[PDB]
Enzyme design. Structure first.
Site, mmCIF file in Angstrom:
data_model
loop_
_atom_site.group_PDB
_atom_site.id
_atom_site.type_symbol
_atom_site.label_atom_id
_atom_site.label_comp_id
_atom_site.label_asym_id
_atom_site.label_seq_id
_atom_site.Cartn_x
_atom_site.Cartn_y
_atom_site.Cartn_z
ATOM 1 N N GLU A 183 -10.380 -0.296 5.455
ATOM 2 C CA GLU A 183 -8.772 -0.122 5.178
ATOM 3 C C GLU A 183 -8.574 1.191 4.857
ATOM 4 O O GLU A 183 -9.871 1.941 3.975
ATOM 5 C CB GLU A 183 -7.950 -1.477 4.484
ATOM 6 C CG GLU A 183 -8.257 -2.391 5.666
ATOM 7 C CD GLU A 183 -6.796 -3.572 4.799
ATOM 8 O OE1 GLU A 183 -6.049 -3.335 4.017
ATOM 9 O OE2 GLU A 183 -6.757 -4.294 6.481
ATOM 10 N N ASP B 286 0.589 -0.794 0.065
ATOM 11 C CA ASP B 286 -0.075 -0.001 0.283
ATOM 12 C C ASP B 286 1.081 1.123 0.582
ATOM 13 O O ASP B 286 2.250 1.162 0.685
ATOM 14 C CB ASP B 286 -1.151 0.235 1.459
ATOM 15 C CG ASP B 286 -1.572 -1.281 1.792
ATOM 16 O OD1 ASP B 286 -1.520 -2.184 0.443
ATOM 17 O OD2 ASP B 286 -2.660 -1.025 2.065
ATOM 18 N N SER C 122 0.116 1.361 7.734
ATOM 19 C CA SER C 122 0.186 1.836 6.619
ATOM 20 C C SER C 122 0.448 3.675 7.422
ATOM 21 O O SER C 122 -0.167 3.321 8.549
ATOM 22 C CB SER C 122 -1.464 1.780 5.882
ATOM 23 O OG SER C 122 -0.738 1.062 4.970
ATOM 24 N N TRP D 266 -4.042 -9.015 -2.853
ATOM 25 C CA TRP D 266 -4.076 -10.413 -2.242
ATOM 26 C C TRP D 266 -4.636 -11.247 -2.848
ATOM 27 O O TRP D 266 -5.823 -11.000 -3.553
ATOM 28 C CB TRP D 266 -5.220 -9.882 -0.821
ATOM 29 C CG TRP D 266 -4.158 -8.136 0.039
ATOM 30 C CD1 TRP D 266 -4.390 -7.328 0.258
ATOM 31 C CD2 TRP D 266 -2.981 -8.407 0.496
ATOM 32 N NE1 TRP D 266 -3.795 -6.402 0.907
ATOM 33 C CE2 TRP D 266 -2.354 -7.601 0.800
ATOM 34 C CE3 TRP D 266 -1.967 -9.625 0.694
ATOM 35 C CZ2 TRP D 266 -1.196 -6.751 1.660
ATOM 36 C CZ3 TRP D 266 -0.640 -9.863 0.998
ATOM 37 C CH2 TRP D 266 -0.057 -8.309 1.502
ATOM 38 N N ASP E 206 -4.674 2.878 9.627
ATOM 39 C CA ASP E 206 -4.192 3.639 8.517
ATOM 40 C C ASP E 206 -4.926 4.870 8.673
ATOM 41 O O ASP E 206 -6.110 4.903 7.853
ATOM 42 C CB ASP E 206 -5.497 3.270 7.109
ATOM 43 C CG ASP E 206 -5.390 1.682 7.122
ATOM 44 O OD1 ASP E 206 -3.693 0.922 7.009
ATOM 45 O OD2 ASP E 206 -5.943 0.410 6.575
#
Lengths: 490, 490
Positions: free
Chosen positions: B216, B40, B100, B299, B162
């Site tokens: 996310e 990411d 992240s 993923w 995140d």
């Protein structure tokens, strides 16, 4: 010069090239000529304890040309036997073809009513011709005698063809297809007390799309509390999943009685969503089923069998029944079970991101594949029919979970045409695919007869197998039934 | 033991395996590490006259593992330069990963706010872990100093990650993604006067689908008279053409001001309809464009580059603008034109039932293909990208006139994953495909930015060309523009 001598000459050409016909594409259990070209089925009738099918036939080579009526017979709508040719062009009114038609029982006399075609000026697609309805009789079921012209069109009407005649109210009715003065396709209804003298009754049907210039091969018949018109429109534009073939075949459901308009309750619907389905005709079976046979082919398609001195196959015969929402449920006739050999039953087959060779001969076979749609979530999941052992060549029949459609893709099938046809997935936990494979064809019956897909395929592999496959997720096959299918001819 | 020594060790591993990285799949003009794994993008910011992109990075091999922040810089959002690693796991609060986060300008001090991840009990997917928001600073833009934990979740809240932080009303706001007590994904909004002391403000967003367990990578930003929330939901079921990827990335449009609910005017919409698009983050450019970069990967996908000691690529940066119906128009940044070499312009290319080798290198190139949809009536018609000279291998990008969709099919692309993604054909006489090909990727921008498709491909051919193709009808290409694209690194 006589039709008797023209038929003998035509039969001798068929017999002459019969020995050059290769097995690779020749159907084991569908109707074909012994050699040469066939198209639209004609003169369907149950007469004197036998099923008769005739068809548009060019006896002299594997291409369309001077049209004859070919003829097969069966006791059981399955074990079809080749007969001598029935009609050869022989008169001014049919010099360039004995085009399509029907058969009736005229007080014990088998009677054919067909379009006579004669070219008046050759200009390719700009040609001028004459089409009139003609009558022939037989005392024996094999040899026919022309009795001449029985219906001529109005002045300025040229396309005027494909009579279908039935008895009602101690009277006869005829439907023909017509291209009218304004260039629209119509079905016209005529009547007669004697089969020789006909009067126009009404424009039975026209379509809302003004680009439909012709309605070929009309058949108008009662089914439950409705009337159904099957026909083959020309000029419908391909629109998304609709009307993909060069020309269309389909049905209109409505209400009619003598003296009334045919009031449409269900608008034009395609009879088959596959590549190769044209020019249906129906008959009433001994036990009063409504049975449809069509040409399992399409104008302008590549026809790889022409290298083998024959072309043209008819579909399986299929039953027609009205659903409660007045759509046709279309199923294979039950008599086909008589061709079944060695049965193989597999239960509960799961695949995920994998392929599986079922090691089952795919030359001539019948499958019933029951798929669990809830748990078959693969992006693409189904069966590879008529497949090379290396799997490089096959006919793909699968669930596309993105489209939510059944796909029949012949891109990798072998010789000739590429691309796919499809139907919407039925609203049901389970998808049942009833699949008939012959040497150059696949017919799929979806669920209870809600939809059919019919496509020609031309595999080049010496051995033909079946694979299951699941891509990007799971396939759940609840049950697979397989039968080898016997040659209908012995 | 010190982060300074852990970063040196990590940089030495990247440098060590950099020499083993093969060119075949390594992107010429997209962000990748010199070697090893990335996912990411993180800490996007225009700071001190430069564009900074960080990313989730495993330096020690080409698989996911102890997560670091990798770092690149550019003057122009295009000529990205590899920098030393910025963050290495080094404390109890981030021992198992510097997950992240974002970057802000804290009164001239470049500040990173990231999730610290630590595993408390290893049980695979049943693992218990601790996620808290942490802060780091830099005086030079290269070397970062950890300042410890700044946000801890409520008891029973585990997934809590995140952070995206922005300045508003001389105050700071933070969004994080959360898995709540009832197992639903939410975005929570927090605020702070000082970046160290945070208070929860509101549940900013949740989704109606109760199977969404996580949101996310939230980013919440003004665009025109609206607020947009970009995020990456987990648990959305694939449904027809919707939500095909393992995990989703998309956007919600609504109205918000401090003190109010975020009232949704446009429900969750995918940001990209292709195979490889996850974990977007945005930045404001110097000239106040809203720019999004994502992980050009997914993923659980096969990642053929892992044989070459690296994995992970970021997308092109793209502009975000609201259409008048409050959908995002998404376009490539204009600065990419600076990479253009040799231009080739072809006008008015027709094909019918044919293929054509354009003999144009497809290693690293940009295309603008303008297609006349009215007259491209082929069942399948378009371009075969990154194709072998024999045409056996290619990435198919075409109009399916039955589906009435644009199809990107990577079944025959090379190594790894098969199958297709798609978008609806736009309501326009013309379809414009703006296509960026790199060594292992295709990005398509449809028309004015109405839709994008982003997929990884892994061609095995030594030479890569382009073909046009039309199957069962016509293709009309009004104009094809081609540019070779220069390596961004020199």
């Amino acid at each position: 010069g006589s039709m008797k001598n023209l038929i003998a000459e035509a039969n001798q050409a068929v017999e002459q090239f019969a020995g050059q016909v290769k097995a690779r594409y020749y159907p084991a259990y569908h109707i074909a000529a012994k050699s040469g070209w066939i198209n639209d089925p004609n003169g369907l009738i149950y007469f004197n304890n036998q099923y008769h099918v005739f068809f548009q036939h060019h006896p002299y080579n594997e291409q369309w040309g001077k049209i004859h009526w070919g003829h097969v017979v069966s006791d059981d709508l399955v074990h079809w036997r080749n007969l001598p040719i029935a009609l050869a062009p022989s008169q001014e009114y049919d010099k360039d073809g004995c085009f399509s038609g029907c058969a009736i029982d005229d007080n014990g006399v088998l009677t054919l009513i067909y379009t006579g075609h004669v070219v008046l000026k050759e200009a390719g697609d700009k040609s001028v011709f004459k089409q009139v309805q003609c009558l022939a009789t037989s005392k024996d079921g094999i040899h026919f005698e022309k009795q001449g012209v029985i219906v001529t069109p109005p002045e300025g009407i040229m396309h005027f063809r494909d009579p279908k005649v039935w008895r009602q109210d101690d009277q006869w009715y005829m439907v023909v297809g017509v291209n009218d003065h304004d260039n629209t396709g119509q079905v016209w209804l005529y009547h007669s007390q004697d089969l020789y003298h006909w009067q126009f009754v009404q424009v039975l049907a026209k379509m809302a799309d003004p680009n439909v210039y012709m309605l070929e091969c009309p058949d108008f018949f009662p089914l439950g509390d409705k009337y159904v018109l099957t026909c083959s429109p020309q000029g419908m534009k391909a629109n998304g999943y609709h009307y993909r073939n060069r020309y269309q075949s389909g049905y209109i459901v409505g209400d009619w009685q003598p003296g009334s308009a045919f009031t449409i309750t269900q608008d034009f619907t395609e009879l088959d969503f596959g590549h190769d389905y044209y020019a249906p005709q129906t008959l009433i079976s001994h036990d009063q089923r409504r049975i449809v046979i069509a040409w399992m082919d399409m104008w302008d398609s590549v026809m790889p069998s022409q290298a083998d001195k024959w072309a043209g196959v008819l579909t399986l015969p299929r039953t027609l029944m009205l659903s409660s929402n007045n759509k046709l449920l279309i199923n294979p006739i039950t008599e086909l079970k008589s061709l079944r050999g060695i049965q193989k039953k597999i239960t509960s087959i799961n695949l995920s991101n994998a392929i599986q060779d079922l090691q089952l001969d795919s030359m001539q076979c019948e499958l019933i594949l029951k798929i669990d749609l809830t748990n078959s979530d693969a992006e693409r999941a189904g069966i590879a029919l008529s497949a090379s052992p290396d799997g490089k060549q096959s006919t793909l029949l699968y669930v596309d979970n993105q489209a939510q459609r059944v796909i029949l893709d012949r891109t990798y099938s072998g010789e000739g045409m590429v691309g796919y046809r499809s139907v919407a997935l039925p609203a049901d936990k389970f998808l049942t695919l009833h699949i008939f494979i012959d040497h150059s064809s696949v017919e799929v019956f979806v669920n209870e007869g809600q939809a059919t897909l019919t496509s020609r395929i031309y595999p080049t592999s010496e051995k033909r197998t079946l694979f299951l496959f699941a891509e990007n997720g799971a396939l759940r096959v609840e049950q697979l039934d397989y039968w080898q299918i016997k040659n209908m001819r012995g």
